[PDB]
Every structure is written in C-alpha cells, then in structure tokens.
Design an enzyme around this catalytic site. Structure first.
Site, PDB file in Angstrom:
ATOM      1  N   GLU A   5      21.674  19.278 -30.445  1.00 17.60           N
ATOM      2  CA  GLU A   5      21.454  20.508 -29.693  1.00 17.60           C
ATOM      3  C   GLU A   5      19.980  20.712 -29.372  1.00 17.60           C
ATOM      4  OE1 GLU A   5      24.087  22.035 -28.498  1.00 17.60           O
ATOM      5  OE2 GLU A   5      25.211  20.493 -29.582  1.00 17.60           O
TER       6      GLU A   5
ATOM      7  N   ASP B 265       1.560   3.122   2.595  1.00 16.39           N
ATOM      8  CA  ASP B 265       1.093   2.770   3.925  1.00 16.39           C
ATOM      9  C   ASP B 265      -0.384   3.134   4.065  1.00 16.39           C
ATOM     10  OD1 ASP B 265       1.054   1.888   6.521  1.00 16.39           O
ATOM     11  OD2 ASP B 265       2.860   2.986   7.112  1.00 16.39           O
TER      12      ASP B 265
ATOM     13  N   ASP C  44       5.790   9.025   4.649  1.00 16.27           N
ATOM     14  CA  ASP C  44       5.909  10.333   5.283  1.00 16.27           C
ATOM     15  C   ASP C  44       6.316  10.189   6.743  1.00 16.27           C
ATOM     16  OD1 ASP C  44       3.578   9.213   6.144  1.00 16.27           O
ATOM     17  OD2 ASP C  44       2.315  10.965   5.764  1.00 16.27           O
TER      18      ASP C  44
ATOM     19  N   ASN D 253      14.363  24.802 -41.383  1.00 19.99           N
ATOM     20  CA  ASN D 253      14.536  24.223 -40.055  1.00 19.99           C
ATOM     21  C   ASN D 253      14.012  25.156 -38.971  1.00 19.99           C
ATOM     22  OD1 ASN D 253      15.726  22.137 -41.412  1.00 19.99           O
ATOM     23  ND2 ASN D 253      17.679  22.215 -40.308  1.00 19.99           N
TER      24      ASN D 253
HETATM   25  N1  LIG Z   1       7.932   8.960  17.123  1.00 15.29           N
HETATM   26  C1  LIG Z   1       7.266   7.987  16.496  1.00 15.29           C
HETATM   27  N2  LIG Z   1       7.751   7.525  15.321  1.00 15.29           N
HETATM   28  C2  LIG Z   1       7.088   6.553  14.690  1.00 15.29           C
HETATM   29  N3  LIG Z   1       5.965   5.930  15.054  1.00 15.29           N
HETATM   30  C3  LIG Z   1       5.507   6.408  16.222  1.00 15.29           C
HETATM   31  C4  LIG Z   1       6.080   7.408  16.985  1.00 15.29           C
HETATM   32  N4  LIG Z   1       5.331   7.641  18.130  1.00 15.29           N
HETATM   33  C5  LIG Z   1       4.339   6.789  18.029  1.00 15.29           C
HETATM   34  N5  LIG Z   1       4.381   6.009  16.902  1.00 15.29           N
HETATM   35  C6  LIG Z   1       3.420   4.982  16.519  1.00 15.29           C
HETATM   36  O1  LIG Z   1       4.076   4.014  15.718  1.00 15.29           O
HETATM   37  C7  LIG Z   1       3.353   3.827  14.485  1.00 15.29           C
HETATM   38  C8  LIG Z   1       4.315   3.468  13.381  1.00 15.29           C
HETATM   39  O2  LIG Z   1       3.779   3.947  12.131  1.00 15.29           O
HETATM   40  P1  LIG Z   1       4.730   4.352  10.932  1.00 15.29           P
HETATM   41  O3  LIG Z   1       4.685   3.267   9.925  1.00 15.29           O
HETATM   42  O4  LIG Z   1       6.140   4.691  11.421  1.00 15.29           O
HETATM   43  O5  LIG Z   1       4.125   5.700  10.352  1.00 15.29           O
HETATM   44  P2  LIG Z   1       2.592   5.788   9.958  1.00 15.29           P
HETATM   45  O6  LIG Z   1       2.327   6.990   9.134  1.00 15.29           O
HETATM   46  O7  LIG Z   1       1.807   5.797  11.271  1.00 15.29           O
HETATM   47  O8  LIG Z   1       2.148   4.482   9.182  1.00 15.29           O
HETATM   48  P3  LIG Z   1       1.561   3.253   9.938  1.00 15.29           P
HETATM   49  O9  LIG Z   1       1.494   3.557  11.463  1.00 15.29           O
HETATM   50  O10 LIG Z   1       2.494   2.029   9.702  1.00 15.29           O
HETATM   51  S1  LIG Z   1      -0.216   2.833   9.264  1.00 15.29           S
HETATM   52  C9  LIG Z   1       2.599   5.133  14.284  1.00 15.29           C
HETATM   53  O11 LIG Z   1       1.450   4.937  13.468  1.00 15.29           O
HETATM   54  C10 LIG Z   1       2.224   5.515  15.717  1.00 15.29           C
HETATM   55  O12 LIG Z   1       1.020   4.885  16.136  1.00 15.29           O
END
Ligand SMILES: Nc1ncnc2c1ncn2[C@@H]1O[C@H](COP(=O)(O)OP(=O)(O)OP(O)(O)=S)[C@@H](O)[C@H]1O
Ligand SMILES: Nc1ncnc2c1ncn2[C@@H]1O[C@H](COP(=O)(O)OP(=O)(O)OP(O)(O)=S)[C@@H](O)[C@H]1O
Ligand SMILES: [Mg+2]
Ligand SMILES: [Mg+2]
Ligand SMILES: [Mg+2]
Ligand SMILES: [Mg+2]
Ligand SMILES: [Mg+2]
Ligand SMILES: [Mg+2]
EC number: 7.2.2.14
Lengths: 898, 898
Positions: free
Chosen positions: A331, A373, A641, A734
């Site tokens: 418990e 990233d 993100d 206890n």
């Molecule tokens: N709607 C969108 N969704 C995702 N990527 C987009 C979009 N429009 C433009 N991008 C480009 O595509 C890239 C893909 O990156 P992601 O990995 O999806 O996210 P991140 O936070 O930018 O990390 P990176 O770019 O890989 S360092 C982005 O950094 C942008 O330059």
C-alpha cells in the site's frame, strides 16, 4: 508457486499518472473497420444541409452562452477519454482504505480484544485509520499537483462563446476537454482538430489525414461537399475527425462529436479493450509489489504459527503477525511513486520543463541516446544574413519580390524564410505588391515534392505561379532561367554551374532556397500539383542560421553525462556537417536517407549504432531509425516539433516537444520544454535522475528496515513467554517512521549516482533487503537479551517494560539507519542529507524518546524506562551504525550500489 | 552646531572594503616629479651589468626555492599597497572594544555599583563585552569573506620557482602580491607588469607606457640598452614599471622593486597623502553616523539631567541614560555595512559575479546608464561565416595565405580574425607557409594607424611585409592592387568601387578587414611604422559575428528595469547599426568620433543624453563620453575588456570587466563577470538592489525602534519614582534585538523596491525615525500606566515588577514591529518575510517571554510576571501593530518609501 491470478492485493496507480495517453490520434491501423452504426450518422451529418444543422445541435451562429454550454456538457459529456476521468475524493479515500491488509488488521484486532478488552481494539483501528488518511492525503496532494501540471500544457481551441454575457462574444482559448457538441470554432495552420467537425466555411483548407486514411498527401476540405459520391465516412470532404492536423488554409466549423462519440473514441477501437499491455515502469512496479507480497507470505505465516503453537492464543498471534507485516505492505508503493516523482516534477516546473505523465521521468533519467533536429536546437531559428542573388550571383530585386509574393499570401506554417523575407522587403514595395497581386489558389507543402507554391494574379487574363523550396526539388521541375535578364532554356551546363555554386555556398553553412515563376493564361479551374512544371527559375536565396551560443557547452555537458546526441535532419548533408563542426559535435560520416531506405533492419540498426549525423531524411526514415535504435538496451528519446514528427515521438521511449510547436507535436509528446534549449534539457535530465534515485532510496529504506524488524521478531518468540512488542506499539513505530520518511523525496542525491544513465533492476531490491535486514535483527536480539537479563523482564507480569524498551530502540534504529544507508560513501563528512530529512529525523527521535514518558504511555500499554537503559541504548545505536557502515563495503564490492 | 572635528566617535571601515583600490596604475599626472633619490637607483639598475645582477638581488637563473623567497619577503616586504594590509584579529578585536560608548558604559556601571553592589557592575560589563564580541565576530566573518572574494579574481604572474623542491622548477601562477624582489618571471601580451622589472631577455617586446609617460605609442624594450643616453628613468629601454601592460612580444625579466619601493608606490605620490577625498558611499555613511551622534547628543543629556534632578542619583542616572543611548550607537554601522553587503556579495558569487569592493554594489544598484561595446556583449566573439574574396569578388587563396602569414607569426593580442584564419587554413598549406617564411620583425597595433603589420622572409634577399586592419586605414596607405592578377595602380575609380562593395557588405552586417603585401630588398635595419607605405592591396576578408541569442531578452529586461543601455563601439557605423537592429536595440542616429572631437563639453553631454549608438571612437572619446554622461544625477557604468579601457573604467562610477580579459582591465575594474553575458549582469543588478534595500531596511529598523524606546523613556521619568527599566535589562533587550536582526540581511525584498534604480538619501532616515518612533512610545506609556494603576507598582519597593513588565512587551515590540515595517504593502498576505527572519523572531520572542520566569531573573533583578499581564501585553502588541500598519499610509503618501 505461480498463482498470480489468485493474488489481487496489488493496487495499481491510475492510468493518468503513469503510462502514455491512450489517444495519440493515430495509434495503429484498425482491422474491425469500425462499427457500421457510426458510419451512417457520419455520412448523414456530412450530407445534412447547413440550414437545419443549427437546430440539430441547438447552436447559433453567434455562439453559446454559459448556460447552454453547461447543459450540452451535462447532456453529452466531456471531451476526454474515459480513462482520463479523475476519481472523486471520497471514492479515492474509500479505495485507499478497503485494502485487505487494513481491513484484516481491524477485524483481527476486534476479534482479539472483543471480550472484556474494549479500548484495546478501538485504538488499534484508530492507528490504522490514521495511517490510511496519511497515505490518502499524500496520494491526493501529489495527484492534484500532477494533474494541474499536465493541464498547463494542453492543446487549445479558439471558440466564439460569449465574453460580455450580453451577446458580445469574441474569441477565447480553452483546453480541448471543454469542447461540447454543437460548438463553433475556427481553425488555422498548425492547430489539430479537437473533435469531429462539420465544415461551415473554408478558405483553402488542407488537412493531414495520414493518421486515419494512411495517405500522406493533404486532403482538401470545402464548406459544401464537392466530391460526387458519399458513403466513405473517412474521405468525406466536409468533415474533419479528431486527431488530424490542419496543414494549411483557414476554416470555421461546428463540433458534432465529443469524447468517445468521436470517430477515434470508439470506432478506432481505443475504447474497446486496449489495456492488455503495460509499460516498463508499470512492469517494474508490479514486480516490486509481487516481491513484497511473496516476502510477506513467506514470513508472516511462520511467525503466526510459531506464536500460536507456543502461547496458544491464535487470534492475538495472528493480529501481532499482521501488525509486523504491516511495514512490508504494498500500500505504500502508490504513495512513493505518486509523491516522490511529483515533487521532482514540481522542481522541473521551475526549470522550464513540464512533465505530462510521471513515469516518463524514469525514461527521462535513462535517455542514453537523444535524437534531435538541428534547427531550433543546434542553431538559432532567426537568420542573420540573407542575400537574394541570381544565377550569375548578382543581387536581384525580382527574386526577393517573388519570394515576398510566395511568402505573404501563403497560409501554411510560418517558416524562418517567410519571416525573414517579410521583414527584409521594404514597406513601399510591400504595399505595391499587395495592391498589384492577389491570391487565386494555393498548393500546400506536401513534404514529398518539397515545393510550396502559390498562384496569384494582377489581371483577369494572366496568372503567375510562384514556388519556393529546396534547390534540387525546384531544379527538377524548372525548364527556363532568367540568366542575364533573358529567358534562356536551362541547359545541363547551367545546372552543373548552379550546383557547384550552391555546393560552395552550402559548405560555408549557407542553406539555399530557390524561387521559380511561371506565367499562364487566365484559368477558372483550380490548380493542382500537376501545374508545377516548366517553371522559369529566378534565383536562389542564401541564408545563414547561426549556431546557438549555448549549443556547444550543452552538448559537452550532455556527452559528459552519457547522453549520446544524434542528429536526424532533413536538410543538405553539407550544411548539417558544417553546423556539427561549428558546434563542436563530431559528425564522422553522414548517411543519406536514400541509402537507409534499402538496407535491412539489422544493417540499419548497426549503422545507427555507429553513426551521428543523418541527413536528407523523410519522417518515415526518422521513425525507422528511432525504432531500430532501441534494439539493445538503449533508451532513445526523440525531440521534434513538426507535423509529421508525432509518429517518431510515439515510437521513441520518450518524446520531447517544445511548447512553441504545432499542437499535434505537443499532444503526442511526453515532455514539454518551455523553450527549445539543450541546456534546459540537460538540467532537467539531472533533476529527473535525482528524483528517480530518491524514489529508489525511499523504497529500499522502507523495505529494508521493515524486513529487518520482521526477521528480528521472527527469531525472537521461541525463547520469549510474551509478545516482544504489542501490535499497537508496532503501528506507532510504523506511523512515526513513515512520518520521518515523508521528507525523503527532498533528500540530496550523491553526484556519483546521477553521473550515468540509471538502469532500474527491481530484483536488486530483494538482495538489498537480504543484505541490510539481519544487521538490525542482531541488535534487536541484543536488546532482547539486555531486557531479559540485565533488567530482569523474565516474566509476563513484567512484560510491558521489555516491550517498551525494544520499542524505543527499534524506532530510533529505523529513524537513524537512514542517515547511514543513503550513500555509497561515508555519511556526515563525505556527504550529508538535506535539512528537511535531518529535521524529521530529530523530531521523530524526540517523539520516540518522549512517548514512554508521555501520559498516553499507560493508555498505549507502555511503561516508563529507567535511566540505566539510556547508555545501553546509545551504545547499541552507535554499534549498529558502525557495523552497517563497515559492512556496506562488502555489498558495494559484491554487487554495487547502482 | 558644527564642531565636526571635535566629534571623533565615528569609526570608519577599512579602506579595502569600501572605496576603489588606490592603485589604478595610472592615477593622474604627477607634479612633484618624484623624489630624485629613487631616480638614481633606477638609472643605476638600468645600466647595471647583467652578470652582477644575480648577486645584487641574491637570485639564480634557475629561480628561487621556498626558503629564499620567504627570506626575501620577510626582508623587503609584500607586493601590496600599505592600505591593503589587513589588521590582525587581536587588533581588530581591541579597536572594536575601545570605542568610547562601551568604555563609558563599563566605567559608569563600575562607579554606580562600586560600593556594596558587586555582581551588579561585573555583569553590566559582561553584557557590553558580549555585544562587543558579537559585533567583532560579524565584522570579522564578513571581512574575511569579502577579502577571499577579492583575491579570487586577481592578476597572476608566471614565475619559475621550484616545484619538485629538488630544483626541477617550472612555471606557476600566483597573485601579484607574492612577487618578492629578485624574482624571475616571463611576460606575454596582455599581462600587466606586476612590479618594476629588469629586462633579461626580450623578443619584440612592446609595452604601453601611456599611464606614466603619457605617450599612447608603444615603446620597445630590449634585453640590453640600445638607447644612447640614460638619465631618463621612465624612458629607459631596459626597465618596465608596475602598472604598464605588454602590448606585444615576449620577455623574461627579474623583479627589482616591490610594494611601495616601486616607482608607482611612492614616486607617483600615491603613498604620500592621497586620502583627502572619500566617495559617495563613505560620505553617506558619515552623514548617517553624524545624524545618529547628533540625535544621541540631543536626547541622552536631557534624560540624564531629568533623572539626576528628580531622583538625586546622578551616577545611576548617567549609567541609565547611556544604556538607553546604546541602541543609537554608530558602532552598529560598520557591522551592517560590513555584513549585509558581504552576504549579497556571496550570492553574487553564485551568479558568476565577483565584487571586488563592497561599496560598488551601491553604484551597481543605481547604474541607470550602461555603456558597453558590441562584440562580446551584443554578438558572439566567434565568427560563423568568413570568405576571403578579392577586389573583383572572387575567392582568393593568396589573400587567405597572406592573412595566415600575418596572423600566425604576430605576437600581439589574439583577435577573432586570427583564430578564424588559423582554423580555416588547411594543415598542409599551413606547414608549407611555416616552413617557407620566417619572422624578421613586428610592428604592433598602435591603435592610431589601426594597422597591425609583420615582416617575414623566405630568402636572404627579399622581405615581405604583410599588414591587416580596418579597410579605410589599409586603403589610405595602399598604392597598388592585384586586381585581375596584375599589379595595376590603385586609381580613384577602383577605390570608389571597393568602397561601394564594402559598404554593401557592411550593411548586411559583415565587417571588412583588408590585407596588404609589400616587397623589400634584404634590409638589416629594423622596420618601423614609416615602412608601411606603397603597399599592394590583396583583398578584404568578410566575416560575420552573429548576435548572441540572449542579447535581445537581456536588453529587454535591462530596459524594463530602467538601465539605459548605450553602445560605444570603435567599428564602422553601418555594422553597429545592423547589429543594434538585429538585437532589437533602437539606435536612432549614429554619431562618429570625429564630430564629438570638436563639440563643446555641454553639447557633447546633451548629445550623449540623447544618443544610443556611438561608432568610430578612440579610447579618449569613450572616456570623454563616459565622464560627460555623469553630469546630472546619472550613475554611468562602463563595461570594457581592452588595453585602453582602463581609463574609461576608472572614469565611470562603476567599472565592469570580464574575467577572460587583459590583466589591466580586470585590475582597474570594480566588478568582474565570470563571462561576457548581459543576462548575468541583469541578474546581478537585481540581486545588488535587493542587498542594498536589505541594508537600508536593517539600518532603518534598528534606528527607529531604538529612537522610539529613547523617546518612551524620555517622557516617562517625571511621573515615576523609580527607573522605568534597569540598564542591565536595556542591554539584554538590545542584545536580543540584535540577535533577532542578525537574519535581516537574509530578508526577502519586495519587487516594487527593486524595479527602479535606487537613490539613497541619508536625510530620509531621520524623517523615517521621527515618523515611526513615537508610535512605540505611545504604547510604552500605555504599559507604564497599566503597570502603575492596574498592577499597583506605585512604590519603589515594588519597582522591579514594573520594569520587568515593560521589559517583556518592550522586547516583543522591537521584535514584532519588524514584520510590519519591512514593506510598503500589507504584511503576511501581500508579502512575507524570509524564513530565517521568522525563525529568529520566534526565538527572540520566546527568549524574552521566558526570561522573567528563568532562574536568572533574580540575578538579572527581574520578577516573575502574573498571568493577568499576558492578555494585556497581547492586546497592546496587536494594537501597536495595527496602528503602525494604518499610519504607514500617511508616511507613504507624504514622502514615499523609496
Ligand atoms: N508545411 C511544411 N511542413 C514541413 N516543412 C516545410 C513546410 N513548408 C516548408 N517546409 C520546409 O521543409 C523543411 C523540413 O523541415 P522539418 O524537418 O519538417 O522541420 P524542421 O523544424 O524545419 O527541421 P529541419 O528543417 O529538418 S532542420 C522545413 O525546415 C522548411 O524549410
Ligand atoms: N592590439 C590591438 N589592440 C586593440 N585593437 C586591436 C589590436 N589588434 C587589432 N585590433 C583591432 O582593433 C579593434 C578595436 O576594438 P576595441 O574597441 O579596442 O576592442 P574590442 O573588444 O574589439 O571592441 P570593438 O572592436 O570596438 S567591437 C579590435 O576589435 C580589433 O579588430
Ligand atoms: Mg490550436
Ligand atoms: Mg484552393
Ligand atoms: Mg528496530
Ligand atoms: Mg598575467
Ligand atoms: Mg623588433
Ligand atoms: Mg519596546
């Protein structure tokens, strides 16, 4: 043995404190294909005319007032999963009291003292009731704090409602749990769908339904159904389900389902069953509880039988044995797990780290591999230097103007390039471009073609398509170039020269984004991805994202702690290599996603084991790498993100998402950082390791001391004509020991224990108990010999003094051994406990000393102690401390502390 | 009144805790022209042959061992100023006891209780002894902590010494205070001269003697005298004096003077007088002490005369009046100033801020204007992007190779350009250049021509001169350019085109550094600044220093606090404007140094009042701006870490220098930051404001309560036939109140008080005392009436009870009113005191309420109190607290808290 099903004494923690949230939005592909009953109402609502929709859900275009929303909430329910409903406090108190051990305690005490012995069984019930309220208070406080912390970072939905209460309305932000059916909300890019929605109006709404329909491509959503044929509930163009995200565009829709009534609620199969598999933390807790139950079942019946056979009072013997076994009850296990971690969570709240569910802390303390990233973590999101050059390298205003056109009219996720282009463009030219051109359509970022495009027009005769994106993807579709101010076809030599120039720019750390423009005649038909062809290349914008100042020290601290930092980026390999070199992180050999897309699972696992920088990755590649990394005792944590990072976050052992992120990333994550900083993560990791070590120390102490007392009394009854202590005295001991231990979650932690990832082995607890138990038993037998011979407690008529004597020592032992077992080192010189622990220890020792001399001692059947007992008590305590300190070395060498 | 010279009871703090260090190295130009006796020994040592120098100072080339250095230290002395010598603890105790108030206390007590009243005058001496020991303990602890903190950041000198104690020797780092005469040390660029040195060997040693000789140009220093004529002690080329810095080159020299024996020690006139002018903090302390002394002289004699005339016992009346006046003694003033600030300093030590002398905290709490330089604070020192282009813009390897040649061989201070050039250059070409070329001479950075130059050679027939620097300075001396790979003369059109290109680069935030190369025939004669002419321009290196991530939030917090941040940079105006825009700091209009060099002092003061970004500044310009800024109630603090920033640091009210800086900047500064971060500075400013507020609160409370008691007893004696309290009881009350107040330095501070710069007005203390004194007097008179009438203490035969009664409430009042006067707000709900203050308050209240019932009460002439008095004292305390809380509003409205 076995018979696990027979044993039901284990009380599991609520599914909100531990275990991930059962609603990631995607989960897994279903095989039951939902119940057909729901997918007729869904179709009807999809095709049901808007004019009569207001009466169906009792909703007005203005919104809902306080009374109407309350009535709707009471009628339909709450926008939460059934497992997310907290229990009422009275239910919590009752379930915390009806456990078999306390009920058996009360029943056996009443039976033993039913006949002519009132006030002997009433108080023994009072003591166990006080213990039960103490446990309930601790659990309730910690659960309330944890629930408050979880709701701090929750997805919000913008709803009209009524602000002034007179019909003025407006726009608010409320956690998604309060979205009742028939509520009007608006949607934007990056906001997840809080519940099933009927689209009322939509401007270029594109949503990602890959969670449900499995298609990565975004799907249009119109105010009125434009698809010809219905009877596909998931693919209807006028409804959006919970768990999906808005890729781009704007919309205003009405809530039509809530809670389990949503498609994901019961049609996805989450409600039905989906509770067979627990996680590692729950399995470890269950193992510890089973170990304690096995120990009690082995020990207590032996004492019961021995006392009953020797003295003939079976009922009193059973009561006394149960009182002895109280200290080993499971418990306590909820409290600890509920309390200690919660306290640590509170401290994490002061370090800009919000923990959603407590169990993650364990993983958050053993995150040996950290996949992140680059941008946001390694480098600042804001870009310092940007120049809009042309193919020849000269500065071009036309390229910047096209970039402004493509970045000001788009409604997708805001990008660092878009913000920098908007800021860099002068106000006068900005107004001129805004007045001249106007949007006609939009082609969102599919993430496969990696090309965002926007169609605009300045006259009703010609439409201009402007697209940005990565250089290679733009070049794959361009046909003409404006080199030297003329429309010359793009030849192979020009492509090679452009590639050389852009590689030179990338090697310096400058990323390259190309802009393409195409002219078409006026066309009423909406544009699609097929129209992006034969584009005229204009130029490439070169920009620099400087590495954060804190990146290098934070990475050095992380690698010193033992957290192997790996990078899974989706950009050019050269840029990632330059960033890693500048921040001091060794890159070794880069690996592209095209290579890993063909390798076997074992080959990819080994490669990820011996690689640090992965570039040009699809989200599927990131998920596969994360999953294959956890193939040999490695606890890998992902930090993302983005829109598509949710599957990667769920795949990893622990998912971390920044507060300033898309809603899906925050919802699917396990830990939320108030800012995208690695130093914050490192400090949080240190604190979480401290908290887990504190909880383990608490459990080890409270198990070891109680097992030692159990052994002490186990080998005592054969040569004693009376109970060595009364059950009331044991309950008091206890309770006082638990009061002392209350402050253990606030104890300091040695830096040795938090210098490496923690691997919690529940089986080590048994060995620790076996090693550190009989040490107390030896001195308890010494106390028995002291009382029997020196003080002549040789007859039952003088039994009570005997008991009282041991009582004091026992309590002090349980209160003092702590200070000599919370280390691998020598206490009070090489390390010290925190001040609250010292205060509680002193208070409990003083109370235990004063109790025999207290007026209640006669009520508690306790006799005052002669002054000759004090020096012997001090000598026994000192000898016990010295013996345990000297014998700690053997346990350290044989098995080790950590 | 006046008669300030007659009053000598005020005790000043040692000149190390407050006031700046009397040895900035430069001070001011002397007029006595030194004593001629020293400037004959200096000349003799300059011309004295090296071979016999070893015997003169008893030094060996291998170094000195522990015994020899100890003997030299004992013989000659310590390398410290005489004012820097801490007093011995017994001397500190004696001076802390021989103050007039305690001596008169003991003498008057002995006189009053000499005849047949022993054990009454002995104990009254024991109480004042205990108070003296308490004061001495607090002062000693705080002074020890402050002295330890000051020595943490001290200039170090590299000395051979003996490590293994067997003659192995080596190189160590010791604070300059331990440099005994006849010690062998080596010097490098950026290391200040710790003491007068005889140059043994020197490679291109250039030092800055502008502190002494007033010439900004560096002066050569050779192993043997190369100057023809001696008899100028300052300008001899073989001696270096303390307080000068090594601009460039390397050297190994022997210590010849130490402490006051150095040229700056006594010949500069620092030893003689130089103590007439105190600073603002000392003046405020003196004003407070004079206020307290005047209040005592006004009040205590009146009480003495009244009691002596009414009762006829003049000696006992004097003893009692002095005991009353004890609470207003200035002897507490050191402790507070010594203790409170020190505690804050300790906290600053945990915030990466080291305070050299305590008084600076006051200025550090009122720094409304902060002048800083951009690089290091606004932008990161390390540069991310750098490209070595040519005039046409193409990448040139020759320019990078010349930059490597000019940055790898130079011995001056390291520049971020030099580090980036060294890292960027490939290893193979680095080895090739190192093997090919070799140094022949060096021309250091004079800071006027702003052109560092180095002469190298690959053959015995030709020498190549390579110089870098700011673009304009290089262009002013270039004649030819390598444009298009040919030696074409540099025409005006080419200069204009280069200027346009470089302005375009600067507007993007890229700084420009040019490289020029010249060929000369093999020349044995050493090169000078005149040889830098007709240079062939090679190219300009464009580099970017990214702004720090924390710069914008820290600047926002600073401007929110009220600290106006101004920038005084010495770079191009465009680059500074771009940096300010990127970090979010508004720049308005830039001002060049050429304009301010001609404006009047008032015009420049107004301009600096209405300007934020000053670019292209000489160090004289920075000093002039800093000095003229402090023309209207503004406390301006400068932050610099350069060679020439020491005069600017001394000119400002507070000087801040980073730990990783040149030795002169650290030595001349007042506060040392462990890193060049603005957020650290902001947090330190907040903490320092808290500490100053705490000290002011301590002083206000301890003065106001004591003045209230003085007034209470002042209007009490006319209508009382006995002393309202015994002097022993007053001493006990004061001691217990001081014990309670011990924890005030640890009190919490309201955020309202630390939201703005603090302007300390000592005259406000008198108004505060006058306002908050009589409130205690009203309730003391109420207590007197309660004792006289209700409890019938109407005769001297029952006097003691009366006294005892008041005693209790008196103490509790002084112990409780604290919690209702440490605010402008309502206590215990809108704000609370820190836990140590609460603990001390509770402890002192318990001790005071238990003293009458203690067995010592008969010894202390105290009588046990009847139980009926307890509700009355509780009611009186509650009424007094409520009245003070209610009337606090009138004081806040009439004058104001801050
Ligand atoms: N709607 C969108 N969704 C995702 N990527 C987009 C979009 N429009 C433009 N991008 C480009 O595509 C890239 C893909 O990156 P992601 O990995 O999806 O996210 P991140 O936070 O930018 O990390 P990176 O770019 O890989 S360092 C982005 O950094 C942008 O330059
Ligand atoms: N020995 C030297 N002393 C001073 N400046 C030098 C020296 N050698 C090269 N320089 C250059 O001259 C510039 C003058 O800057 P200072 O103000 O003296 O110091 P700082 O820390 O660089 O602050 P800045 O340059 O004004 S932003 C330096 O930034 C260097 O680029
Ligand atoms: Mg949202
Ligand atoms: Mg559209
Ligand atoms: Mg025990
Ligand atoms: Mg040095
Ligand atoms: Mg030379
Ligand atoms: Mg009083």
């Amino acid at each position: 043995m076995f018979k696990e099903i027979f044993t039901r004494l284990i009380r599991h923690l609520p599914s909100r404190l531990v275990h991930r949230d059962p609603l990631p939005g995607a989960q897994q592909t279903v095989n039951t294909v939902v119940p057909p009953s729901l997918s007729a109402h869904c179709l009807k609502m999809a095709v049901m005319p808007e004019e009569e929709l207001w009466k169906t859900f009792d909703t007005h275009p203005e919104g809902l007032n306080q009374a109407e929303v309350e009535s709707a909430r009471e009628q339909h329910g709450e926008n939460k999963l059934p497992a997310q409903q907290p229990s009422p406090w009275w239910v919590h108190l009752w379930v915390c009291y009806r456990n078999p051990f306390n009920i058996l305690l009360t029943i056996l005490g009443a039976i033993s003292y039913a006949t002519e012995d009132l006030f002997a069984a009433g108080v023994i019930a009072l003591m166990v009731a006080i213990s039960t309220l103490l446990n309930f208070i601790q659990e309730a406080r910690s659960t309330k704090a944890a629930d408050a912390l979880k709701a701090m970072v929750s997805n919000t939905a913008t709803v009209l409602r009524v602000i002034n209460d007179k019909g003025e309305n407006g726009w608010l932000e409320i956690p998604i749990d309060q979205l009742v059916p028939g509520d009007i909300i608006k949607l934007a890019a990056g906001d997840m769908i809080p519940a099933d929605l009927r689209i009322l109006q939509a401007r270029d709404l594109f949503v990602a339904q890959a969670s449900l329909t499995g298609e990565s491509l975004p799907v249009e959503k119109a105010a009125t159904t434009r698809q010809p044929e219905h009877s596909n509930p998931l693919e209807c163009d006028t409804l959006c389900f919970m768990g999906t995200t808005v890729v781009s565009g704007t919309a205003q829709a009405m809530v039509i389902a809530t809670g389990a009534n949503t498609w994901f609620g019961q049609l996805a199969g989450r409600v039905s069953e989906q509770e067979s598999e627990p996680n590692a933390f729950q399995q470890g807790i269950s193992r510890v509880s089973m170990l304690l139950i096995r120990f009690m079942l082995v020990m207590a019946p032996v004492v019961l039988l021995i006392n009953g056979y020797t003295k003939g009072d079976w009922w009193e013997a059973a009561l006394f044995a149960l009182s002895v076994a109280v200290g080993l009850t499971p418990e306590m296990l909820p409290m600890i797990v509920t309390s200690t971690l919660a306290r640590g969570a509170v401290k994490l709240s002061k370090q800009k780290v919000i923990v959603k569910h407590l169990d993650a802390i364990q993983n958050f303390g053993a995150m040996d591999i950290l996949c992140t990233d680059k941008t946001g973590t390694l480098t600042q999101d804001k870009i310092v230097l940007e120049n809009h050059t042309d193919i020849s390298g000269k500065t071009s205003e036309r390229v910047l103007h096209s970039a402004w056109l493509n970045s000001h009219y788009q409604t997708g996720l805001k990008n660092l390039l878009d913000t920098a282009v908007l800021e860099g463009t002068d106000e006068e030219s900005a107004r001129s471009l805004a007045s001249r051109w106007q949007k006609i359509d939009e082609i969102p970022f599919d993430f496969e073609r990696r090309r965002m495009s926007v169609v605009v027009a300045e006259n009703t005769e010609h439409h201009q398509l402007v697209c940005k994106g990565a250089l290679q993807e733009i070049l794959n579709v361009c046909s003409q170039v404006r080199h030297n101010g003329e429309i010359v076809p793009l030849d192979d030599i020009m492509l090679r020269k452009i590639k050389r120039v852009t590689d030179t720019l990338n090697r310096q750390g400058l990323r390259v984004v190309a802009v393409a423009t195409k002219y078409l005649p006026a066309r009423e038909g909406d544009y699609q991805r097929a129209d992006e062809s034969d584009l005229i290349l204009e130029g490439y914008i070169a920009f620099l994202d400087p590495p954060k100042e804190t990146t290098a020290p934070a990475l050095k601290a992380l690698k010193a702690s033992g957290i192997t930092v790996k990078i899974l980026t989706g950009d050019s390999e050269l840029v990632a290599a330059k960033v890693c070199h500048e921040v001091g992180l060794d890159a070794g050999e880069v690996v592209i996603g095209s290579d890993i897309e063909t390798l076997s699972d074992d080959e990819l696992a080994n490669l990820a084991q011996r690689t640090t920088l992965f570039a040009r990755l699809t989200p599927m590649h990131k998920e596969r790498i994360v999953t294959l990394l956890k193939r040999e005792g490695h606890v890998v944590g992902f930090m993302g993100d983005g829109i598509n990072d949710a599957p990667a976050l769920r795949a990893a052992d622990i998912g971390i998402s920044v507060d300033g992120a898309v809603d899906i990333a925050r919802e699917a994550a396990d830990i939320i950082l108030l800012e995208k900083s690695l130093m914050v993560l490192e400090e949080g990791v240190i604190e979480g390791r401290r908290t887990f070590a504190n909880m383990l120390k608490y459990i080890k102490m409270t198990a070891s001391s109680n097992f030692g007392n159990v052994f002490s009394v186990l080998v005592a009854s054969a040569f004693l004509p009376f109970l060595p202590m009364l059950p009331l005295h044991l309950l008091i001991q206890n309770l006082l020991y638990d009061v002392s231990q209350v402050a253990i979650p606030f104890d300091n932690v040695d830096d040795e224990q938090i210098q490496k990832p923690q691997r919690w082995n529940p089986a080590d607890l048994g060995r620790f108990m076996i090693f550190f138990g009989p040490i107390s038993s030896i001195f308890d037998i010494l106390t028995f010999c002291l009382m029997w011979w020196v003080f002549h407690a040789n007859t039952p008529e003088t039994q009570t003094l005997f008991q009282s004597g041991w009582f004091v020592v026992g309590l002090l032992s349980q209160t003092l051994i702590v200070h000599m077992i919370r280390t691998r080192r020598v206490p009070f010189i090489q390390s010290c406990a925190s001040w609250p622990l010292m205060i509680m220890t002193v208070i409990v020792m003083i109370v235990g000393i004063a109790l025999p001399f207290s007026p209640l001692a006669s009520y508690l059947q306790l006799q005052a102690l002669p002054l000759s007992y004090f020096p012997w008590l001090v000598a026994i305590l000192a000898g016990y401390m010295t013996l345990t300190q000297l014998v700690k070395g053997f346990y350290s060498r044989r098995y080790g502390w950590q």
